[PDB]
């Protein structure tokens, strides 16, 4: 394993600043020293397949342009492409391309690092198994990871109690998981998008986070996955068409016939402007997460808006003001944005079919037919439910679209 | 002289269904109403009910108004066909309708035994016969001494025991002084127990009087038939001395069609010479004159 | 009086009716099944709203089974041109029909709300009798007014028709018209147009359907939540005050009787 | 060839007999008439000549064949009473209906529906017909084809005396040319001078059959004599009384004699010759009559 | 053969009844009415419109056929008709050819107007698609219809008044159509330590209106066991009605 004083770096300007320029190198480097290196385009660094190719341990190193090919894949002993170590505080990595069967950026202990910008295709043939993690963050205060490009990795921007940093403007495309959160405090996350996932956010135990902004095209079974997150921030999120499927290994998920949201055991936050889109489940809310502000989505095209499996009320509307519901067959006479009545989405024969399966053959009885008039008929039998008051009769995210 | 009526023309839709029948009924004689089921027979039996209002004319019934109800409990109006409540009971209709026309409630129990109903009493009118209907019918008709009874054709779908049992209870009702209009269409049996018939006809009433006078003024023949008889031969001429045309048309069916002005003639023939077996002078009937007055109209 | 004399026998036929008495006692244990489950979830606005949806569809059915052949029953059965030869009017034989049906009416409601009643006295422990007697007795004295409605709109489409087996398609005609089309129209028109026909002329089209009226009345005051309403939250836009709407239901009746004696005179 | 030969039926139900050694025997071309109550009596007997019912306990030989072939309904009418067609069909469709059912060819539908009289009311509903209306449509039904036995239960309910007289003036047409029918009335006054012979059964048994003139011959029953004015009432009172006859003392210039028909060969010769016989109406006893004896007779 | 000639009076006799006429004409406009919400707004439009065939079909057979027998009965033209060249048999087969091409008609009226609101508002709505799922509609319409026709006449045949035979006929629409899968329903919700949910798949086989959705919506049994079971359920009932019409 040498270092990157081995190379043949032409200086540019001496404020201990390199520039490596075009042609390939062998192995894995090594930086001790606080060196502001850049990069010709042409300078393609293919390490043998073995080891952390581009190790960092001074702080303040600003490795810029490289292109990084084939490390290793031991995910036990964390063959990276970028190792950064605790000790090499603010290290900037800017527009790089990996292509290597490990971990992309394994950064621990550091503070303020700055991964911007990359482009990392992580396999074409590992099970999702195997393919290491495109950005792990692991305990990192400080960091600024912005508009990268992550491609096949194995659960794409892993976060491990990390506890200040956003995540601004990234791609993620064909991974098992797009961001996924471990004890992340007071964490933000702006604008990214998650692409053909199978599961779109994991969002497990982490508090005081703002998630704003962010998109999910065509992602399976899990659009938004929310697992303990309490005093959080849900404002602008698009979730579109979340297909069925299944991840897999079925090791911390299940599979799903498609939720844009899934909402575990999530007591305290505010859920306001979002777009559901397509789905199967528009949103489900677990018995154990109640009480938080729900208000101001658009719960448009999906074939069951509202999964609620208890019978206490839960009025989804803070300040007056309600969701869009694309079913809501409802009038507005005095000339405000709200609707007249209120929206109940699930029946009392809508909750029969996810507390018994077997209804399933009798869903197109009239005696089925019969059952949802006697409730709009007879409220007495209505079992309280997942009602807002005033909702939206037109779409509020006209800009999430675009 | 119960019912009045003089100078009738009923109008309605401008088409003049009934025209100047000048009807006048005795206080105890029995008529009887015989035109068809059409326009003529059935607007003059509404006119005496007073459930209709007669254009260009008065009908007074019982010396006052038709329509009055100091007359009107004093009617009785047996209709064609009433299949009448059949959730309710025999006692229970009958005590029904005497309390509507005023009558006291002691006539119920001793009108469902003079009528042939005492058995189907307290039992409900689904269960009950088309005869026992007309017996039903007929119960509520004599409620309360009435002094014009008008049945509509009360013999249908009856026994003949109770049919030669009802006219006898209409012929108890006659000595008693209350005159009964029988507007029926089964007309042979009711020429026995009518005292005048009224055969009316495309409005106008064609012809009104007794049996004897609706003889008298048509000349009709005497039809004497002797199913049967000794000698054949002799039996074709010995009557045809007269004019009395020997037709038949069976073995034995010889019905002679007489004239009736020779009625001398042929009995001294008979009776002096020569012994009889079986003579038959056979009455025109009332099949036979209503055939000749609803055929002299058209 | 001849106006009792034939009223006397319509309470006596009517109460042989095995079809009324069977949909009189689906009348009682609904209400005690309606009443049980809002003792059981306790609520007080839900278990209102449903029992004057239960009267409006059971309470114009038992006056539609009980009319429809009023009078072309009588006429096709005989003993109509009967009964007019008897010293009556047609104006005493069609409101001593009425009085004598519109007694069966308020006995097969008396019968509901009373056991009604006596599931919510013996069921909520601690209920307040008087807030009991006041609410269920505006349930009493406003659905046989809703009855005696579909009382005489069966007069009307029975001195029309001349055959009882055609009464009977317009009786089930104007019970399904009255209860769950014109609530059905109604919405249409509010959904297609989105609110926006006209804000001022359609609460008062409310007016237009007694059975509207009906739950005008026992809604006003136990409104509680919107949907419980559903297209009653107009009623809340309607400026008339809860007298007029007493008023309103009994010009239902005059108008509608006046007509039912307007076309019987002419029979 | 006797058409309908009932030998010797017992028809029970179940511990009753409701018609008990029923022994009739209609000719050829007789017109024979079932008369009796409304009861079992009659209308189980009604049913043995069809092939409805079967003999618990004989035969019948409806023209010499077995009553439920169907050789012999294609040749049997039957109008039945109180019948109620089908109300949204015409008249005209609902004779084209029963022709194609009894194999007559539908060249005899337009000519049986003018020969009862409905040219004017066919191609209209049953439902705006009366009831006489009716029983022209019923009775076009049961001359279809060439049949050779009716049984006009009660036929002329309803019609008018022309229609009535029509449909008599039918039968004497239709029993020349060999069709022996049978009537099952209550109208009695009318059918018996039509009736070739009586058939009046009480409850259970059969109780007389025979011509009219062998009903009056066996069962004594007295001739009903009416005149008017021969010579005086008051005169002629005395006469009937001495010879055992009743002579009704009435209002005034009105003899109503009672006689008992075993002398009145010669109770008319002193009438004769002593006055004119210029309004005079002898009248045999009736068949309302008739049928009033052979009910006390048995019951 | 005069199973025809009285099947020819009874397609003429039921297409004039205004009673049939009204809910035909109403099933063929809410047939389109939920094709207009169901293109505008394939499988999610013909499921409901399984539930609308479900909720009339068994009332239009009703309709017709209730008073059949003792409809004939009472009007007398049943004891008529005994006498005539006819087996108790052709009447009651020839009543199912002339009542079940009435319903056999009125779903093309009333389907005939759907598929055409189907495949002329979707505009690449891929037509061979189209008339095999509708082809197996139309066909499995009739057979549900076929079914309460023979019901019709079970009941019809049993009773002597025309007024206590609708008292049976809404009495079967009643209990099998939606007290059946009411009582499946309580069966499943308020029972469960003593009913096997896998014995509930051979309980849809009682009754004809759930046989009828589940070849609508395609389960341990094939296709084929749903098409003999739901000819098993004419052919029993009316082997069934005509061992009540030889008992009258
Ligand atoms: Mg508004």
């Known amino acids: ?247 897999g290994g079925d090791s911390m998920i299940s599979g799903g016939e498609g939720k844009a949201l899934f909402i575990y055991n999530s007591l305290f936050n505010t859920i306001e402007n979002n777009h559901f889109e397509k789905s199967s489940l528009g949103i489900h809310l677990t018995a154990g997460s109640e009480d938080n502000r729900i208000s101001g989505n658009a719960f448009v095209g999906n074939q069951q808006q509202v999964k609620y499996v208890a019978s206490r009320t839960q009025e989804w509307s803070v300040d007056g003001r309600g969701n869009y519901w694309s079913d809501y067959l409802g009038w507005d006479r005095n000339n405000d944005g709200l609707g007249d009545i209120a929206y109940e989405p699930n029946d009392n024969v809508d909750r029969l079919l996810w507390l018994y399966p077997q209804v399933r053959l009798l869903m197109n009885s009239p005696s089925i037919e019969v059952l949802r008039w006697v409730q709009r008929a007879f409220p007495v039998i209505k079992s309280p439910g997942v009602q807002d008051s005033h909702p939206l009769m037109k779409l509020p995210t006209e800009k999430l679209l675009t | 002289n119960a019912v009045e009526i003089q100078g009738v023309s009923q109008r309605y839709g401008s088409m003049t269904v009934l025209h100047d029948l000048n009807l006048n009924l005795g206080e105890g004689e029995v008529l009887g109403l015989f035109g068809h089921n059409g326009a003529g027979k059935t607007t003059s039996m509404k006119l005496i009910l007073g459930l209709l209002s007669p254009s260009e004319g008065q009908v007074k019934v019982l010396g006052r108004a038709p329509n009055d109800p100091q007359v009107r409990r004093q009617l009785g109006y047996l209709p064609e066909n009433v299949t009448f409540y059949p959730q309710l009971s025999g006692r229970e209709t009958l005590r029904h309708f005497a309390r509507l026309k005023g009558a006291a409630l002691t006539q119920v129990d001793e009108l469902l035994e003079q009528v042939g109903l005492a058995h189907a009493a307290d039992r409900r009118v689904k269960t009950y016969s088309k005869g026992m209907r007309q017996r039903l019918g007929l119960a509520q008709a004599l409620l309360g001494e009435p002094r014009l009874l008008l049945l509509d054709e009360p013999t249908v779908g009856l026994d003949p025991i109770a049919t030669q049992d009802l006219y006898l209870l209409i012929d108890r009702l006659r000595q008693r002084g209350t005159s009964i209009i029988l507007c029926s269409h089964v007309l042979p049996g009711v020429e026995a127990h009518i005292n005048r ?62 004239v009736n002005g020779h009625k001398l003639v042929l009995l001294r023939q008979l009776l002096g010479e020569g012994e009889p077996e079986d003579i038959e002078i056979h009455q025109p009937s009332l099949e036979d004159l209503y055939r000749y007055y609803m055929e002299r109209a058209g | 009086n001849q106006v009792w004399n034939i009223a006397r026998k319509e309470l006596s036929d009517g109460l042989r009716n095995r079809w009324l008495l069977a949909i009189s006692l689906l009348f009682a244990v609904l209400a005690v099944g309606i009443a049980w489950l809002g003792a059981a979830a306790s609520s007080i606005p839900a278990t ?220």
């Open chain 1, 1 to 247: 394993a040498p270092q990157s004083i081995t190379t043949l770096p032409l200086q540019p300007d001496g404020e201990n600043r390199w520039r490596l320029p075009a042609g390939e190198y062998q192995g894995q480097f090594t930086i001790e020293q606080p060196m502001q290196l850049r990069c010709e385009p042409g300078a393609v660094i293919q390490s043998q397949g073995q080891g952390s190719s581009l190790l960092i341990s001074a702080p303040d190193v600003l490795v810029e342009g490289c292109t990084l090919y084939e490390w290793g894949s031991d995910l036990t002993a964390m063959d990276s492409a970028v190792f950064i170590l605790p000790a090499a505080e603010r290290a900037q990595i800017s527009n790089n391309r990996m292509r290597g069967p490990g971990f992309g950026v394994f950064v621990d202990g550091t503070r303020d690092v700055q991964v911007i910008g990359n482009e990392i295709d992580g396999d074409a043939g590992v099970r999702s198994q195997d393919r290491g993690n495109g950005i792990h963050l692991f305990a990192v205060s400080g960091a600024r990871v912005l508009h990268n490009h992550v491609r096949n990795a194995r659960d794409g921007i892993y976060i491990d109690t990390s506890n200040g940093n956003h995540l601004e403007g990234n791609v993620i495309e064909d991974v098992r998981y797009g961001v996924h959160y471990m004890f992340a405090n007071e964490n933000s996350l702006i604008d990214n998008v998650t692409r053909r996932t199978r599961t779109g956010y994991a969002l497990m135990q982490s508090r005081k986070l703002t998630v704003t902004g962010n998109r999910s095209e065509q992602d399976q079974n899990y659009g938004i996955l929310m697992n303990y997150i309490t005093y959080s921030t849900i404002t602008g999120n698009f979730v579109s068409d979340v297909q069925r499927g299944d991840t």
């Open chain 2, 197 to 258: 018939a009224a055969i009316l006809a495309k409005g106008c009433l064609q012809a009104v009087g007794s049996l004897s006078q609706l003889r008298a003024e048509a000349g009709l023949p005497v039809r004497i038939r002797a199913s049967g008889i000794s000698e054949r031969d002799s039996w074709l001429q010995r009557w045809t001395d007269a004019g009395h045309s020997a037709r038949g048309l069976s073995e034995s069916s010889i019905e002679v069609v007489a």
């Open chain 3, 48 to 267: 209102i709203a449903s029992l004057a949806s239960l009267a409006t569809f059971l309470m114009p059915l038992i006056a539609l089974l009980l009319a429809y052949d009023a009078i072309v029953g009588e006429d096709e059965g005989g003993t109509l041109m009967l009964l007019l030869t008897y010293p009556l009017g047609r104006g005493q034989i069609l409101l001593g029909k009425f009085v004598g049906h519109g007694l069966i009416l308020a006995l097969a409601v008396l019968i509901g709300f009373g056991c009604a009643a006596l599931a919510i006295a013996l069921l909520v422990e601690g209920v307040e009798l008087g807030m009991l007697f006041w609410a269920f007795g505006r349930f009493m004295i406003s659905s046989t007014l809703l009855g005696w409605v579909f009382l005489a709109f069966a007069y009307v489409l029975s001195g029309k028709v001349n055959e009882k087996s055609s009464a009977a398609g317009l009786a089930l005609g104007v019970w399904f018209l009255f209860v769950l089309v014109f609530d059905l129209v109604l919405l249409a028109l509010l959904v297609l147009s989105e609110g926006k026909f006209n804000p001022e002329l359609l609460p008062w089209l409310l007016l237009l359907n007694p059975t509207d009226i009906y739950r005008l009345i026992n809604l006003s005051g136990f409104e509680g939540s919107g949907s419980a309403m559903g297209v009653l939250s107009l009623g809340a836009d309607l400026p008339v005050p809860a007298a007029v709407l007493w008023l309103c239901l009994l010009a239902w009746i005059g108008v509608s009787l006046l007509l039912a004696y307007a076309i019987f005179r002419r029979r």
